[model samples]
Target: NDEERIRIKEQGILQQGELYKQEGKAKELADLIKVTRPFLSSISKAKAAKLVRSLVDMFLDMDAGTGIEVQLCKDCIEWAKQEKRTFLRQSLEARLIALYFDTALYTEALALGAQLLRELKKLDDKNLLVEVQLLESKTYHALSNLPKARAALTSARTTANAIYCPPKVQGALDLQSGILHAADERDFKTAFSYFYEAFEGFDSVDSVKALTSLKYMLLCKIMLGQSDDVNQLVSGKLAITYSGRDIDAMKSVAEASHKRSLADFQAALKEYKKELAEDVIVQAHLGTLYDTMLEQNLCRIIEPYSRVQVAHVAESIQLPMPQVEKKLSQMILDKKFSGILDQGEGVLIVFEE
Candidate 1:
């Protein structure tokens, strides 16, 4: 039976799939999907859909270049379209859009997002629309286009509100709303409330998003300059569920802020480079934190002495000499402080009353 062979071959393919993935064998995966494609018509529609999606999953979540993995997704997407598998094509395209985002190709993601939104609207697919709209909102969020981001998120929420939305989507909406609130006028109070709701929503679903939501909740407390409360949060009954680097990232920032030590803050950032630096939200807010520390501590040091060695100021702040020197010069240009730098002697002459 030809169909029997297809089902049998399918079992063998999936059995070998994990081994190939574990061994970092991309070429074998390429062959697997290609080989499976021929027998796809021999299977039931449901099994064919399952087989196609299963093969695509192997290509995803790997460390292959943004180029090759995306091409593989495109290949599957093209096949789905040929088979008139509208739902499957949309799903694969969603992955492609997300991949474009993580790889920092926003325009492509946005264009595809716009295309998908049109088709989704035509199909009256409210569920998929909510997700695509969320993705579109995030791309705007990434681009610093806050006003459009807020609008997109609002549309996504209205659509989701009418549907029998699940906890994961509810959490996603709450998270996006919090980001918008936080971005606008530093509304940490509103932001914190939204983030807290999101954390609980994600927690109920046992989704990984719960961890990130917890991180955002702590970040809001820090941004409000209430670093002490961060400790309280970490010790809270609800927070104990998602401990480790997720919580540690915010706690370390709080500790460094409490110490009023710029060097400590910088060190914390370096240490949790993945948790802090890689996240756009944390890094953007920390920019203000770093600048504020400079204004306070650097000014504290400079205020005491009329003529100070750049070396001494650097030592006092425990930051690099060049950074201290350049900031001192910037203070002069920005007129935040009056200072003339002496190039030959590496000293700052404070022109003050």
Candidate 2:
């Protein structure tokens, strides 16, 4: 009994064991915990909790294949609660919240994030507070609550500014900022600047986030009519390795938009429907892009004529006459061009000034 208890209390031995287990030089610590469960009750709650913490950390450092890390984290939190370890429980719960976010479990993350906010307020841990707020921001964005998302992100930015954050966190903040600017504000130029900064920050850390940032950067460039920049951006080593179907689809869209080819754009939309539909940001701008394309075609068709029959313009653009007239009226109202649609004659009169 003395020897068994003594072995459990050796921190240095456990640390060395953890290294070997992590490096595959020994059996995994998680498996070892199961093998030694018979003696766990003999150990003090504090020592057992410490060992469990180490196990959870090990699982977290492993590749996330089956969500085992999240389960282990939850189990540790339950154990901490049972042992009356308030701080440990809170810490484990925080880790659980992060896991939920990483797993795209926004509903769970938001609920827990709210609860953690109340608890964290009492503790006033700025770092944890910023983290929870960032999670809240991401959750709100996923739920399409732009106002709430921006509010939460603002709070997170303020908190983050008060402290020294790592490049990874900074990059995340900038990425979210760019998304809000592009998706909510429709300010592609501003979004491009933010994504550029975020790409640099994520790149320096060699984070996978850098690839996502670059994707958004290309998106902003495309939306800003800088489609020519796509090839230059994708030529980077990271972008080259990460370019897949999604990136290729986006490149096709950019190329079609640059050429102002409505047929090519339509074909791209049809061919890459899944890729385009999967990204909320891209989907949000697709309607505007369609309108822009239509307007460009309309301008080209009407350039040489001061007055043209609506039916003729409609046939030229392959749209219904009434739809073309309605769109022309909208464009006129939007100041896209100095033009008047005469309903009586069913013609559009253009002015060059």
Candidate 3:
């Protein structure tokens, strides 16, 4: 009876799939049962119209057994295959494969991307073909397959042009293409071009969703030393926003803790044994484990000069600039110490404190 039940369900799914195909109503099939909508969306009609895409995104987001959405994705793909709905089947595969990527299941994602790409080749729909190619490129990008990612992106771009895709899709593709070039290929110039192009497209929409990504683009430009563009963007207050009450409070605490630690460090300067006392606060704020490393590294450098180049220390330690800068900044807040050290003349002088 259990097997019979499964057979009947499968038969029903296949029948529904045929009806859905004939009707050309992919959303109806996707909405036949309740589905999760964890992602942000204010447009109900847009969500329904893009149900399959949304469902794929939900599936790709599944990770570490945290959500039941993955199971739903699995079921939907099975049903699509059973009903011989090639478009839906390939679409699910593309999304599922991309999800495996977000979940760090890189190998599995690549395999699925390949399968989806093969299926997509059989389709004549220009829009669908481009969409599949874009998804496939994203999978390769996630896998760090730069060559393959670029190839897929190029192909998708051509197809997108052929169909005259909307700005949203084009913007997304441009953003992703820039990411691949900058992060994977390490091509700054090309990446910057893509970033600006994507930014222009998103800016046209001027929606909150679009504005959020524009902020990230500004950050990317800053990190790349494109200071002129960064200044232009900042001048417009394009990135002005506060996180929430809780985040502001955490920032305050983090600042206070840092200042206290720095004060302890300064107070201990007059007494060698007293330095150990300062370690308590420093250790607590920076974590007990990191305290040892920080003391060994930072203290040694600063011993000869009460101030040192943050960038130099970061480079010597092979740590990221942001991480080192944040630690030093926190210390300044906690200890009430302030000054920028110019390492030019091999002299350490404390500026305004």
CA lDDT of each prediction against the hidden true structure: 0.84, 0.79, 0.55
* Candidate 3 or 2, higher lDDT: 2
Clashing pairs in 2: none
Model 1: per-residue lDDT, tens digit, 1-353? 87577668889878787678888888888788888777777777777777777777777767877789889988988988988888878877887888888888998989999898888888765998998899999998888899889889999999987798888888989999988888764699999999999988998585578888889888888888788999988798978878788688789988877776677788899999999989877877877888866766787788889999999988898878978888888888898887799978999898765
TM-score, per-candidate, Cα-based: 0.79, 0.75, 0.51
lDDT of 3 by residue, 171-207 (tens): 8787777666666425656766776677678764744
Best by lDDT: 1
lDDT of 2: 0.79
lDDT of 2 by residue, 300-347 (tens): 788889999999998888988878999999989999889898899898
> What TM-score does candidate 2 get on C-alpha atoms?
0.75
The collision pairs in model 3 are 60-99, 258-334, 259-333, 259-334, 259-335, 260-334, 263-335
What does the lDDT read for residue 341 in candidate 2? 81
